[PDB]
Amino acid sequence: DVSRFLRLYLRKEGYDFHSSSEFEIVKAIKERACYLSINPQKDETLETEKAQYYLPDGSTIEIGPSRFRAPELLFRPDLIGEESEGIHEVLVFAIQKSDMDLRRTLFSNIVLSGGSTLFKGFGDRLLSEVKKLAPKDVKIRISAPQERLYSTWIGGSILASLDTFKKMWVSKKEYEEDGARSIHRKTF
Amino acid sequence: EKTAVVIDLGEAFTKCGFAGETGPRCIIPSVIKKAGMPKPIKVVQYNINTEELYSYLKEFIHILYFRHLLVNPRDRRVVVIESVLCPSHFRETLTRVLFKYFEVPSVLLAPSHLMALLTLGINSAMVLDCGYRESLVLPIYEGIPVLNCWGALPLGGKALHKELETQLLEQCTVDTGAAKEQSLPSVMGSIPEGVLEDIKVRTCFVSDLTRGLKIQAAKFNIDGNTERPSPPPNVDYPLDGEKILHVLGSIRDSVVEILFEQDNEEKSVATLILDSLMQCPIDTRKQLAENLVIIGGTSMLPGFLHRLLAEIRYLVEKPKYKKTLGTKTFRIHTPPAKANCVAWLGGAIFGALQDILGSRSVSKEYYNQTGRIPDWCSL
Amino acid sequence: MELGELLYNKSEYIETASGNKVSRQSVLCGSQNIVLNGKTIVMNDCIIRGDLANVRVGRHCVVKSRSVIRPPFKKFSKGVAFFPLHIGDHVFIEEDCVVNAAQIGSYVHVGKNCVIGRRCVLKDCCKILDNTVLPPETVVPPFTVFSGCPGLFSGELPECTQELMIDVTKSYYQKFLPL
Amino acid sequence: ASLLQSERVLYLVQGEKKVRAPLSQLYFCRYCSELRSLECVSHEVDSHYCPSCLENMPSAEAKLKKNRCANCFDCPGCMHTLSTRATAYYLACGFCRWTSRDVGMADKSVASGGWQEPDHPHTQRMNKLIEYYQQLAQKEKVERDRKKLARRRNYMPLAFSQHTKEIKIEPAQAVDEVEPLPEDYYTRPVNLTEVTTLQQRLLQPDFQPICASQLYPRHKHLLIKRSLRCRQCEHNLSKPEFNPTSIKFKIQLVAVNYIPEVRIMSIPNLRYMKESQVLLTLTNPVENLTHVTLLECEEGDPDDTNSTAKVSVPPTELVLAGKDAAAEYDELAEPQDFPDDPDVVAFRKANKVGVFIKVTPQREEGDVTVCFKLKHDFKNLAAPIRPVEEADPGAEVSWLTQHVELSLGP
C-alpha cells in the first residue's frame, strides 16, 4: 500500500509509473530513498534538497517531498482515506487489549519483524508515537534485530532443527485418514 | 460582485469564459507563437524549470484575459479547473502567476471530476476523464472524492496520435504531384501533430465490440488465415496543398483499438472503471455503478460511449470481476454540455455561487502573507 | 539592417519633378487621373492604371518594383463603376505587391508580394506581413497586423508607429539618390 | 519597426524582472526615473470595438451581447468577416465561396434585424441547477456565519433562545444503453468537405457539430483597446473614447520619445576586426548625453557580451529642432565646430551624431553581441512647473544610465 501511495505522490511530482513493470521500480525507489520524519509538519515547511534517484534506463528523477510523506501513511492511514488504526496504534491496542499485569512486560519487550520496519527512522518515530499513547513513566524497549527482513525464516530454521518439531508436523498418511481438520487442529 | 472567470488549462485545449453561462466563450489550442520559433511552444509542460514555465503561462493568461475574454484581471475572481494529481510545481506556478503578475482577487483550485458531477445534479457518481495525456478515473461519493480508489492509464489523445503516426508510416501512400501518382512511402520523416489530430477527428471512428474483437485477433494473426472484417473505403487527405495522402480503411478502425486492447496486463480504458469500482467501499458499489460520467474530448470520438459500455459488460463476465461486479447495472449519464466542455460547465455553475466561492477560494492577502497554496498533500 | 537604412543608387533614367521621383521603366497608363502631390517614389516595373481612377498618394509615399495599384470596380445595381482609391500620407508598398484596395490609410507598411482584395479599406497605422491575402471587402484597425491566406488579426504593432514610420519613409527617400 | 530591424539593439529595464526589449516597444515612466517594458507594466481595459464595422460599444452592452457585434458576422469555414449580398438577403464570404444558403438558413426581408443564432439547447436545465445550488449555498453561508459568530462570541454554544420553502431539482435519468454508431459509417465514402475540421468545430463550442449543414455562422468577435498602468507609478498612457478610425493618443508616452535612441548606421566586416559607425539622435528639444561607460566588469548581466567595445568618447551635446530645416542651414560654433572630434565623431547633422565604436569580433565562433551603457540628461519636470516656470537644474543634472545591448548581423 505504501508502494501504491508513493506512485500517486510521484504522479503529483510529475513522474508516471502506469505499467506493472514500472510499479516494481517504485518499490525500488521506496526501498532506496524514503525516511520517516520525527515531526512531519516541520519537514513539509522546510525546503527539500530534492535527492536525485537513477532509474534502470539511466534517467534521473528528483523525488523531493514525496520521499518522506509516502511512508507516513503507515502511521496515519486516514490522510489518503483508508479506515485503519495505524502501525503505532495496533502495537499499543494489542498491549492494552491484553491483561493489566502483562502490559508493563509487553511494553518492555517489543520486537520489530518484516521488511516494512527497515524505513530510515522507523524505530525513532514509533518510540515517540507509542510513548504519547502508552501510560506515563513506563519503560518502552523496541528491540529490532539486524536481520529484520530474514527474522521470520531464521525462527522457522531453529524451530525445524528441534526434535519437538518431529511431533508437531502432520504426516501424509495422517492427512488421508484423519481428514481436513488434521492441518488446523495441529497448527497450535 | 462581478461574474467570476473560469479557466481550465489542458495539454491539447484550454476552456475559457464567465460563470453562469450555458458553455465556454472561447476554446483554443494551449500554445503561444513566440518570435523565432516556427512551431508554437506548448504552454503547459510538466518537469521543466519554473522561470521558463512562468514566462509561458504569463504569455498565455495575457492572451486569454484580453484577446479571447475582454475584462480586467484585478477586478473579478478566478475559478481554475485542474485535474486531481496535477504536478505540484505547475499548480504552484499557475497560482503564483495569477497572484503576483495579474494580481487577481482569489483563485479556487477545483478538481475537474467533482465539477463534472455538479453539471448533472446527482450528488454521487463515477467519473472517467479520457484527456490528451492520461485517461484518469476518480469515484466521487456525495461530494467527497475517494483518492484511495484512483486509476490512470496513458490511453488518451497523445497515445492515440502517436499510434496513428506509426500506422500511417507503415502503409504510407501519398500523391506528392511530381510523378507520385504511384504509391510513395515516407516522403516526410515525421507528420505534424496538427494534421494527425485533424485525420483522427474526421477519418477515424470507434468500431463495435463484435467487429473490434475480430480486428484485435486479425492483426495478431493467431494461427488463422485472413480472419478480419471488411474495412471502410480509403479516404484521401490533403497534406500541405499538393501532397494527397491516401488513408487505408484498416488504419481508421485499428488506431482506436490500442485504447480497448487488453495487452495481457488487462489494462484498457474499459477495465479502469471496473478496476477502480472493485477497490471502492462495499456500500458505495451499487450507487457508483448506476451513475457513470464520461467527460474528456477523447470520448467525443464517434461510437466511443457504446463500445465502452459494451466492453464494460463483457469484462464484467470475465472471471476476475465476475464475483464482485457480477450482477451490477451500469448506466451512463448524458451531461447537458458536450463531453469536452463538462469540466468547464461545473466551474461556471460553482462560479455563479458568489457566497460559497469567496469563502472556499484562497484570497491574494492570504497568499502574500503565507506563500502556501492548500493541496491534498500534507500541510 | 540594425535600425540604419542602407544605400540604394538610382540610374540616370527617372522622372524627377517637384520632389516626386517616378521610374521611366514603370508604366502608369492614365497619367491624367493619377495625382502625386508630395515627394513620392515609384520603383521600376510598377503599375498605377487610370481605369476611371483618382489615385491620390502621400507626402513621402514609396512603391517598390513589380508592384501594382489598380482601383476596384463597385458591383452597384444603379451603375457598375471603378471606385477611386486614396493612398494616405507616408505609405510604404513593398516589392512585387498586388493592391486592389479602396481608401488605404496613412502611415501603413504593406508587405512584399501580398494580395489586397477588392474594395478593401485600410485605416491609419497598420502593417500587412509578406505572403498574405486580404480578401475582398475587409477592414484592418489601427495598431494591427493581418497575416495568413485567410488574412486575419495576428497581433498588435508597437505603440510608436505614427512617430517611427515618418523616419523610415523620409530616410529611404533621402538615402535613395542617383549614382 | 519591422523594415528596419528594431529587433536587434535592445535596452535593459531595472526592477525585479530584467528584460531585453527594443526602445520602440518600451515605455518611459515620468512620475519616477526608470523606463519599464510592456511585460513589466500592468494592462487595463478601456473600450471594445468591432474590427469590420468600427463601432465603440460600452462595457455593459458587451457583457449582455457576450463580447460580439450584432450586425457583423464571421464565416465558420474560413475565419473572415462576412458580407450581405441580395438577389431578399444571403450571407457570403469573399475568400471562400461559402454561402448562408449552403447550410440552409432562410433569407430575411430586413437586412440586419432578421439574422439570429438559435438558443442553447440546455439553457432551461442550466438555470434550474444554478437556483438549486444558490439556495443550497445560501444554507452553508448561514451555517458558516452562525458557526463563526458563535466562535467570535466565545459563549461555548450557550442556548439563550430556541435553535432551528425548499427547492428540489430531479437528478438526470441514466440511459440503460447509449445510441450505437450508425451502420452508415461502415461501407460509405467519407467526403472531407461534408465533415468539419477541429478548428472550425471548436469556434462554435455550445453545440460543436460534426456535419457542415448544422454549423451556423457565429457573430464577429470584438477587439480590445489596451491602457498601461505601472506598479510604482499610477497612470502611464491611455487611448481616446473614439479609438475607432483614430491614431491619436490621449497621453503619448514611449521610450523613443524621451530616452536618446541609438541606431547602427553602418555595419563593417565581421572577420575578427572592424570599426562600426552608430548614430545617437536626441528626441527632447534641448538636452545633453554621453556614451562613456563600458558596462563595468561582470556587472549588470553582461553574459550576452561576445566582444570588447571601447566607445572611449566624452559627452557630446546634441539638440532637436522640431521644424522643416534646409540642407546645412547654419553652422553653430560651440555645439559642432569646437568638438571637431574627427576620429571619434563621424558626422553631426540636425538631431544626429555618428560615433565610431572599436568592436573585437570572433571572440566566440559567431553571433557578435556588444554591451555598452548610455547616459542622458533627463529633464524629468517631476515638480510643479507651467511651461518650464521652475529652473529644473537638479532634474537636468540627473544622469540616467540605460544598459544597451547592440547585436551585430554576423
Ligand SMILES: Nc1ncnc2c1ncn2[C@@H]1O[C@H](COP(=O)(O)OP(=O)(O)O)[C@@H](O)[C@H]1O
Ligand atoms: N531496506 C528496506 N527499506 C525499506 N523498505 C524495505 C526494505 N526491504 C524491504 N522493504 C519493504 O518490505 C517488503 C518486504 O517484506 P517482507 O519482510 O519480505 O515480508 P514477509 O515478512 O511477509 O516475508 C518489500 O517488498 C518492501 O516493500
Ligand SMILES: Nc1ncnc2c1ncn2[C@@H]1O[C@H](COP(=O)(O)OP(=O)(O)O)[C@@H](O)[C@H]1O
Ligand atoms: N470535438 C472533438 N471531437 C473529437 N475529438 C476531440 C474533440 N475535442 C477534442 N478532441 C480530442 O480529444 C482531446 C481532448 O483533450 P482535452 O480534454 O481538451 O485536454 P486536457 O485533457 O489536457 O484537458 C484532444 O487532444 C483531441 O485530440
Ligand SMILES: [Zn+2]
Ligand atoms: Zn515609474
Ligand SMILES: [Zn+2]
Ligand atoms: Zn461589427
Ligand SMILES: [Zn+2]
Ligand atoms: Zn469563409
